[PDB]
Design a protein around this ligand. Structure first.
Ligand SMILES: [Cl-]
Ligand SMILES: [Cl-]
Ligand SMILES: [Cl-]
Ligand SMILES: [Cl-]
Ligand SMILES: [Cl-]
Ligand SMILES: [Cl-]
Ligand SMILES: [Cl-]
Ligand SMILES: [Cl-]
Ligand SMILES: [Cl-]
Lengths: 16, 16, 16, 16, 16, 16, 16, 16, 16, 16, 16, 16
């Protein structure tokens, strides 16, 4: 799975 | 300091 | 899903 | 210390 | 949106 | 879009 | 300046 | 190409 | 604590 | 060694 | 030093 | 592909 930084505000590490 | 993210929607960043 | 960090204090992680 | 990844499948993380 | 490092060369942060 | 960094005297960011 | 991820809980990008 | 952290376990910087 | 990528090879995310 | 993003403008990955 | 990206077509990296 | 690092300290990179 990819480890993708993400934000909608906080930044989070999404796991895809 | 830290980079923050915000919306105006478009995502934009700032530093504090 | 999202990688979460929480305080166990030492940092700990989960994925939801 | 460092974050490590493992599977239970879903990816999960730990700290060591 | 995703925050994805990218290169075509410089590295850049793409906002997707 | 691209996250840009520029000299504002400290670093500042914009997204295009 | 360095761009260092950190956490105390949210992740954030420190600007040092 | 994207520079995406990735894990199947080790993390690596994937070049896509 | 800082989240710092490092390598000794693939990478690891140090928690300092 | 540490892999640390930085910026003075471009982002770059420093090797320390 | 810093990692730099270049084309060979694949993206490749070097250190300076 | 993966960005890989080599070192016994100076660091060299490669894409596999
Ligand atoms: Cl996968
Ligand atoms: Cl500071
Ligand atoms: Cl430690
Ligand atoms: Cl599955
Ligand atoms: Cl989105
Ligand atoms: Cl917090
Ligand atoms: Cl701390
Ligand atoms: Cl591939
Ligand atoms: Cl190759």
């Amino acid at each position: 799975a990819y480890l993708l930084f993400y934000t909608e505000a906080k930044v989070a590490l999404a796991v895809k």
